[PDB]
Write a protein that holds these residues in place. Structure first.
Motif, mmCIF file in Angstrom:
data_model
loop_
_atom_site.group_PDB
_atom_site.id
_atom_site.type_symbol
_atom_site.label_atom_id
_atom_site.label_comp_id
_atom_site.label_asym_id
_atom_site.label_seq_id
_atom_site.Cartn_x
_atom_site.Cartn_y
_atom_site.Cartn_z
ATOM 1 N N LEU B 14 -13.811 44.825 42.390
ATOM 2 C CA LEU B 14 -14.864 45.281 41.724
ATOM 3 C C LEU B 14 -14.535 46.218 40.581
ATOM 4 O O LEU B 14 -15.006 46.029 39.404
ATOM 5 N N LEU B 15 -13.724 47.148 40.743
ATOM 6 C CA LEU B 15 -13.321 48.350 39.759
ATOM 7 C C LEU B 15 -12.460 47.499 38.711
ATOM 8 O O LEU B 15 -12.883 47.726 37.443
ATOM 9 N N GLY B 16 -11.538 46.430 39.036
ATOM 10 C CA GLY B 16 -11.195 45.777 38.054
ATOM 11 C C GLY B 16 -11.791 44.955 37.192
ATOM 12 O O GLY B 16 -11.635 44.590 36.011
ATOM 13 N N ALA B 17 -12.734 44.347 37.910
ATOM 14 C CA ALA B 17 -13.673 43.488 37.202
ATOM 15 C C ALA B 17 -14.774 44.109 35.914
ATOM 16 O O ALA B 17 -14.796 43.924 34.998
ATOM 17 N N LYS B 18 -15.255 45.265 36.576
ATOM 18 C CA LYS B 18 -16.133 46.110 35.747
ATOM 19 C C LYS B 18 -15.184 46.605 34.854
ATOM 20 O O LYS B 18 -15.617 47.026 33.519
ATOM 21 N N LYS B 19 -13.717 46.748 34.711
ATOM 22 C CA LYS B 19 -12.906 47.354 33.955
ATOM 23 C C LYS B 19 -12.644 46.187 32.825
ATOM 24 O O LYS B 19 -12.625 46.626 31.591
ATOM 25 N N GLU B 20 -12.635 44.748 33.326
ATOM 26 C CA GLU B 20 -12.538 43.775 32.251
ATOM 27 C C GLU B 20 -13.785 43.264 31.642
ATOM 28 O O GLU B 20 -13.769 42.212 31.070
ATOM 29 N N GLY B 21 -14.729 44.096 32.040
ATOM 30 C CA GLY B 21 -16.061 43.826 31.344
ATOM 31 C C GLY B 21 -16.889 42.699 32.066
ATOM 32 O O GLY B 21 -18.063 42.711 31.411
ATOM 33 N N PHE B 22 -16.365 42.323 33.121
ATOM 34 C CA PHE B 22 -17.269 41.494 34.012
ATOM 35 C C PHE B 22 -18.374 42.173 34.715
ATOM 36 O O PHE B 22 -18.539 43.621 34.820
ATOM 37 N N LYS B 23 -19.478 41.628 35.228
ATOM 38 C CA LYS B 23 -20.497 42.062 35.935
ATOM 39 C C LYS B 23 -20.053 41.974 37.278
ATOM 40 O O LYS B 23 -19.334 41.092 37.629
ATOM 41 N N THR B 24 -20.853 43.008 38.053
ATOM 42 C CA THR B 24 -20.328 43.099 39.408
ATOM 43 C C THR B 24 -21.530 42.731 40.628
ATOM 44 O O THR B 24 -22.579 43.269 40.305
ATOM 45 N N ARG B 25 -21.310 41.974 41.642
ATOM 46 C CA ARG B 25 -22.022 41.771 42.802
ATOM 47 C C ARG B 25 -21.154 41.893 44.120
ATOM 48 O O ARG B 25 -20.366 41.058 44.231
#
Ligand SMILES: Nc1ncnc2c1ncn2[C@@H]1O[C@H](COP(=O)(O)OP(=O)(O)OP(=O)(O)O)[C@@H](O)[C@H]1O
Ligand SMILES: Nc1ncnc2c1ncn2[C@@H]1O[C@H](COP(=O)(O)OP(=O)(O)OP(=O)(O)O)[C@@H](O)[C@H]1O
Ligand SMILES: Nc1ncnc2c1ncn2[C@@H]1O[C@H](COP(=O)(O)OP(=O)(O)OP(=O)(O)O)[C@@H](O)[C@H]1O
Lengths: 293, 293, 293
Positions: B14-25
């Motif tokens: 999740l941290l990596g996703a939020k880091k790449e600008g993606f939304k998190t669930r």
């Protein structure tokens, strides 16, 4: 503005302060100053035979694991200096009485205490305040059930400015009790030499967070404001967590390179830098009373 | 867009996703949600008794080491959700049959199997799927030659978007089988508690890369598209590498702080962030079909 | 401009050079080039059966722990190539004679040497240049008192451009002598497999700095310019430091993720990057003669 004794974790502390834009002041002895004076992170370097000069005005003192060994608990609680995060808390890691009271008050499982009712032999025990003996048992302390199995030091930072508990890392001590890892010989001393940053299995963190939250709650009672900056819970992992102790201040295992803070922040940021960011945040909001003493 | 079960390595993910600008669930259970809800890296938090809600539309599921334990292999292969990197591959780390087939197919040396034809005693052996016994041997599994000598977990990321194999880190497990390091007592469980990032001697990396390349090739055959994102080869270093297993998904030892990625990128970037960057790269190029399932 | 042999710590070295804006050239063999050619950090890749092509003009060679094993000491001291940091120093870690001379000259405590006058048995010893034996002792080397207790590898960087000694990290080797940590079996080889970054207890650093400063001083005598870039002191921590060796060049345990450099710099920066920044600093100041050979 930011000053502290040279030892334990002053490097982490000062680097984090100079990183948050604060000014730096280090109190160091003549024998240890050569090393620290060569560091670009120290602005004002106060050399002294004794560190009892805790009249440090202007700045915030920021304590660590050497303060009581360099200054009594009495002197500190009645000290004139500003001091980061509570200050009456610092004594809670000093005795079994306080350590137990808090851990019991938080519902945290602790290693059981053993009064001479062994299982001689092959039933070894740990003697705290260290060293471990077998059957005999003959020869201020406490006796605990011996538990083999990775010792984890969880670092926390409860922040008033943000009103949240942050689980920022898990440390593992490097003891002289090694050299047995390669080839076991005889019982060695458990004195720490250093610290290893360890990425804990994710399924265990929630449990630790719960224990941490509970700790903050009872400390808010047991000691009025209760836990303002860093603190650590020490555990023995059997496969079921038993608390062996706590850190009423920046632990030291925080000198290791932990990430986790990246979960609350975009950037890495160490425990010493976290303390400084807590300070800077308070400044910019006229808080600053909620985090000092 | 990016969702996954709360455990194993969802933090890193999740941290990596939020880091790449993606939304998190994040899908989490009631008991574990207190901890995860306090994390600024989660946008949509789906609490649930069971994780079987794998109908997660919109987003990409991104699997890890808990998915089969939370959901059967059947359900996943026939799941409706989008899913990152292949998906038929995930089962290849589940049995000896598949593990061997692939490792043999790649020409990777594996620890030899032993059927009751010991060398009793002082000839101990390892019993997988763990625990190690001596001569006796009396008391679904396999018996392997006991090998002492650092266990290394190599992390890889084959990327279709870049058409290259990336060696991103080497992990070392923290087992409860310690506390013997300080002072050996009795055989302890090999359950992992955490992971330590380790900088491998550079002269050994080329060899691992070769094994990795070979693994990708045969997996591209043995399982049609074969290995799209992260995977790991597990070894026992005798001084001559013997494979003991594999990870058909993000390993977990990837939660440790590895660099290496800095060799392909200017920045550090974790495995969870690598998976997310793979996703973002696919988006910006209308690929995105080459990396999902 | 920046080139070196592919092994030991060339990854760290090249990444740091490409990071400081320098161009990159790697000499690698056919068997090892697949891995290295896939790395975005190498600009010019010189494949070769032998590395004896040390006529490398234009660039600065930057040596490491494989240079003598790939090229004799003679060839290097009379080499045509430019070379980073002294070069006559590289031989000082090659023999006991030189190692002792320097360590004695710096007043650094060293492990005591033992000539067959044991304490048979249970009095084991270490045999260098490895392996450890007991009483018997029957079966180019030296015999040393066996010392159990964490082995620390301190990394230093004396910089002429800045005229200061930098303590940049503390490493811990990952030996195959493990797998005994979990469960001890028999004496294993001490061959390194990797390196673990370790945050040393802060109260011990000053002492190491002192030893380091002293080492620089005597090397400035014993070998004219004496120690220009990276070097390392190897210790056995009994609870009282005993030197066991040195690194007359970038050690290797510097591949681990150390901070510390953040004490002299705002940024992390590895040892390989430190060497490169030293180069760039020299360039921008027409020095560059003070750091090469
Ligand atoms: N109950 C126990 N059983 C077995 N080993 C133990 C036990 N408690 C502690 N140890 C050993 O000691 C180490 C932990 O020491 P610990 O951190 O509790 O010392 P300490 O309390 O910080 O000393 P001090 O109070 O002077 O700061 C572990 O590495 C572990 O191996
Ligand atoms: N052949 C062997 N000989 C000696 N020790 C072994 C051997 N194989 C594994 N081990 C021990 O077990 C550890 C590796 O465990 P491993 O990673 O293979 O468990 P695992 O396969 O991930 O368990 P699971 O399949 O449920 O995920 C090592 O630390 C090592 O000490
Ligand atoms: N005096 C000693 N007593 C006990 N163990 C020792 C002693 N010296 C070294 N060792 C063991 O060997 C390891 C250090 O090996 P070391 O770094 O000295 O090898 P090395 O000198 O680098 O080999 P090489 O010279 O070929 O590069 C340590 O981990 C330690 O356990």
């Amino acid at each position: 503005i930011v000053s502290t004794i040279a030892s334990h974790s002053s490097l982490q502390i000062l680097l984090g302060a100079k990183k948050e834009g604060f000014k730096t002041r280090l109190y160091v002895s003549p024998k240890r100053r050569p090393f620290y004076s060569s560091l670009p992170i120290v602005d004002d370097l106060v050399v002294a035979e004794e560190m009892t000069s805790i009249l440090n005005d202007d700045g915030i003192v920021v304590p660590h694991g050497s303060f009581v060994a360099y200054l009594g608990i009495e002197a500190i609680e009645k000290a004139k200096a500003r001091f980061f995060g509570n200050r009456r808390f610092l004594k809670w890691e000093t005795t079994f009485e306080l350590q137990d009271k808090a851990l019991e008050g938080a519902g945290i499982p602790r290693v059981e205490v053993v009064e001479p009712e062994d299982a001689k032999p092959d039933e070894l025990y740990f003697v705290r305040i260290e060293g471990s003996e077998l059957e005999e048992r003959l020869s201020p302390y406490r006796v605990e059930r011996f538990i083999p199995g990775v010792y984890l030091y969880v670092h926390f930072f409860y922040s008033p400015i943000l009103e949240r508990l942050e689980l920022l890392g898990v440390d593992e001590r490097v003891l002289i009790a090694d050299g047995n890892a390669r080839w076991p010989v005889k019982p060695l001393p458990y004195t720490i030499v250093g610290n290893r940053a360890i990425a804990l299995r994710e399924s265990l963190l929630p449990q630790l967070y719960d224990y941490g939250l509970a700790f903050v709650r009872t400390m808010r009672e047991l000691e009025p404001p209760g836990v303002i900056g860093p603190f650590a819970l020490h555990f023995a992992y059997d496969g079921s967590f038993k608390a062996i102790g706590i850190a009423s201040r920046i632990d030291g295992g925080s000198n290791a390179d932990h990430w986790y803070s990246e979960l609350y922040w975009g950037e890495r940021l160490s425990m010493g830098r976290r303390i400084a960011r807590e300070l800077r945040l308070a400044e910019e909001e006229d808080r600053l009373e909620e985090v000092v003493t």
